[model samples]
Target: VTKKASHKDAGYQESPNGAKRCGTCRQFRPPSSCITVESPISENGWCRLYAGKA
Candidate 1:
């Protein structure tokens, strides 16, 4: 597996970036986790790598 990016390096935050958020991000997993980012992410959180889910 690829190395996951650290929260600091990924610019992770506990707040949503408007319509862009972990809930809408492609990397986000159900509950509280991420594919590219470190674990313990919130559905309302946001990061620099945020990508809209297809």
Candidate 2:
């Protein structure tokens, strides 16, 4: 079985009423990763495990 990460399993740690999203986060699985979720809104959406990239 292939172990994968989910929106909840990804450990999305966002601030209270902050601006962050998976598309912008560093850990956010991109087009290649099988765990990347594309949102129709802002690229940066606040979450609980936002590991930002530089």
Candidate 3:
């Protein structure tokens, strides 16, 4: 199955207070986009489905 998630899902984390960020997340699509985030996510955005680069 696919790894689908939301912005405030679980692993989602941004800078300052979070450990995982959408910008560095493996699931990030770049340029304000994510593989799990429904809408156009920002590079500074966070999500629970965040994963390390493959």
**Local error of candidate 1 at 33, Å?**
2.0
Task: Give the range of the ten consecutive residues with the poorest summed lDDT in model 3.
Answer: 10-19
Off by over 4 Å in 3: 1-17, 50-54
Task: Rank the models by TM-score, top first.
Answer: 1, 3, 2
> Where in model 2 is the C-alpha error above 4 Å?
1-18, 32-47, 50-54
> Which candidate gets the maximum lDDT versus the true structure?
1
Residue 52, model 3, lDDT: 50
Query: Candidate 3's residue-wise lDDT over 1-54, tens digit each?
Result: 666556566444455235556667676666766667666676776643425552
Residues 1-54, model 1: lDDT tens digits: 778889898998778877887877777778878877788888787888735463
Tell me which residue pairs clash in candidate 1. none
Q: How many pairs of residues in model 1 come into backbone collision?
A: 0
Model 1 scores what on Cα lDDT?
A: 0.78
Q: Which RMSD values do the candidates have, in order?
A: 1.9, 5.5, 4.0
lDDT of 2 by residue, 1-54 (tens): 466555465443343234355455565455323244323223444444434453
Worst 10 residues of 2 by lDDT: 32-41
Model 1 ranges off by over 4 Å: 50-54
Each model's lDDT comes to: 0.78, 0.44, 0.58
Which predicted model would earn the best TM-score? 1
Better of 1 and 3 by lDDT: 1
Cα lDDT, model 3, residue 44: 70
